Design a protein around this ligand. Structure first.
Ligand SMILES: [N-]=[N+]=NCCCC[C@H](N)C(=O)O
Ligand SMILES: [Zn+2]
Length: 544
């Protein structure tokens, strides 16, 4: 009955999707699929973050227009996300007419309300290329240790940090020319004006404890005005009434989510939903799944921008940690910096979705993909606990009972124990306590397999006149499988489709209250095969 708009952080167009991105998109998708299972109106929205100096320069290097380049990466990204079954209702681009209009609208409202300031700043400028240089596009000699070819505000030899203006014999990374300081008028968003409102939100109790504590650190350090303009040449949106000035990519990026929803509504011919979700009086819920590295933008700048332009603010922010492989940050040299596209050449999407989900929680802690554990856990939980309930019982049903399940539950009490768990498991999915949900589900899977072992179908099957007993036992196991797969439906989309084909029924949350009785099931190839370390080693080698 609820109206829910869920988003993920837009990936930058100048890089491929990797395991880090996947943690976020998978976490959001699991939540979204669960919400849909409970009957809510859900809109899962995302887009590609396509603006900025890095993108402009990359396109020039490739000898193609930025439009062509971002279009190609947009397609690559969507192909990868589709491969992992991330169920977006719309995947748009920050480089769109919807975002241009909404960005200009919000800026205009902020300006009229007195939240935009004008001030001149001094910045390194490449006189040959003819452009201001972001810090990472300036290189030179470290002022401290004198090591050459250091980039930006830090030295990778002695570890010193400094303003790029301190670099000795500075050189433009773009042209090799010596940059010089040049003045430029910039537009600033008055974030400080929203301090009280933001502090009230922080203490409201909606945000994760860890996020709130971090925000207090930021309030203590003090909020500052935000530089939201960038000089031409730039790939982005030009600022109205300010020739040669553009909106900094980060200003238009989150607005791109609004743009993506507007685009969806417009394509659907829906003239009412945009305002219903974004106006101040909205009764719809808005959630953003994001990583801790961008919390400053989404928890401070964003709500302030919306407030200042008369739009509703986020209902909540769901923050996740970093993804590590084998306990450490992804390493290219070790072949642990894994691309989403590469992953799919070796393993299926469900395996990673399951592993991440088993480790995820409502906190911001990092999630570790230990490859040895990945093999053991997938084989133990998916193949040996859940799918086992179907694979060890389906054969007898198809071969000896024409594929027809028993007319009654052999153990109603046990079945009730399984359906009684729906409340706690659903609450776990709802609260994003994924690890807890999986633990509950697997504990039930253990009970199901214990039941089968107690009945010993491999013994009953060889004994005279025990046909009825065999059908009863095997049918009971299949019904327990039906329940478990329902609880796991948000997690394993593909295995779920195969399970639904086998069971000849769509799995719904409430449907578990009615077991499958005197019901025909279909034969199946192999619902889920085992994986091994040889495959893991191949994945790593292919990633080097
Ligand atoms: N959520 N949200 N708003 C926009 C997020 C933009 C994310 C950015 N492209 C990044 O990769 O850090
Ligand atoms: Zn140094």
């Amino acid at each position: 009955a609820k109206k829910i708009l869920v988003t993920c952080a837009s990936p930058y167009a100048n890089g491929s999707i990797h395991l880090g991105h996947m943690l976020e998109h998978i976490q959001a998708d699991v939540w979204v699929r669960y919400q849909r299972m409970r009957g809510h109106e859900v809109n899962f929205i995302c887009a590609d973050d396509a603006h900025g100096t890095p993108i402009m320069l990359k396109a020039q290097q490739l000898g193609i227009t930025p439009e062509q380049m971002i279009g190609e990466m947009s397609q690559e990204h969507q192909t990868d996300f589709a491969g992992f079954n991330i169920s977006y209702d719309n995947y748009h681009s920050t480089h769109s007419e919807e975002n241009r209009q909404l960005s200009e609208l919000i800026y205009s409202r902020l300006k009229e309300n007195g939240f935009i300031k004008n001030r001149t700043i001094s910045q390194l400028y490449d006189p040959e290329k003819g452009m201001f240089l972001p810090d990472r596009f300036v290189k030179g000699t470290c002022p401290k240790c004198k090591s050459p070819d250091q980039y930006g505000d830090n030295c990778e030899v002695c570890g010193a940090t400094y303003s790029p203006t301190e670099l000795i014999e500075p050189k433009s990374v773009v042209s090799g020319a010596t940059p010089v300081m040049r003045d430029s008028e910039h537009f600033f968003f008055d974030l400080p004006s929203f301090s009280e409102m933001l502090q009230a939100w922080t203490r409201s109790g909606a945000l994760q404890e860890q996020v709130a504590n971090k925000m207090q650190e930021w309030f203590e350090s003090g909020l500052q005005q935000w530089d939201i303009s960038r000089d031409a040449p730039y790939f982005g949106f030009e600022i109205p009434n300010a020739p040669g000035k553009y909106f900094y990519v980060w200003l238009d990026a989150p607005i791109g989510l609004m743009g993506s929803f507007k685009n969806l509504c417009d394509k659907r011919g829906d003239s009412v939903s945009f305002d219903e979700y974004w106006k101040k009086d909205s009764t719809a819920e808005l959630y953003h799944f994001i990583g801790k590295d961008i919390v400053y933008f989404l928890s401070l700048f964003w709500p302030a921008m919306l407030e200042g332009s008369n739009f509703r603010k986020p209902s909540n922010l769901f923050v996740h940690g970093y993804v590590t492989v084998n306990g450490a940050k992804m390493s290219k040299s070790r072949g642990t910096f894994i691309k989403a596209s590469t992953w799919l050449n070796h393993f299926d999407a469900d395996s990673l979705r399951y592993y991440y989900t088993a480790k995820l929680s409502s906190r911001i802690d990092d999630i570790d993909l230990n490859l040895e554990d990945f093999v053991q856990r997938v084989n133990a939980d998916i193949v040996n606990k859940v799918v086992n309930l179907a694979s060890r019982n389906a054969g007898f049903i198809n071969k000896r009972f024409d594929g027809v399940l028993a007319s009654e539950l052999a153990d109603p009490q046990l079945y009730k124990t399984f359906t009684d768990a729906a409340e706690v498991i659903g609450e776990a999915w709802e609260s994003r306590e994924f690890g807890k949900a999986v633990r509950e589900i697997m504990a039930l899977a253990d009970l199901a397999n214990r039941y089968v072992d107690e009945q010993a179908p491999w013994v009953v099957a060889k004994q005279e006149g025990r046909d009825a007993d065999l059908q009863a036992i095997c049918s009971m196991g299949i019904n327990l499988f039906r329940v478990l797969m329902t609880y796991l439906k948000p997690v394993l989309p593909k295995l779920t489709e195969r399970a639904e084909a086998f069971l000849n029924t769509e799995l719904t949350w409430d449907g578990i209250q009615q077991p499958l009785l005197g019901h025909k099931v279909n034969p199946f190839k192999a619902l889920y095969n085992r994986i091994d370390m040889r495959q893991v080693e191949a994945l790593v080698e292919a990633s080097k």
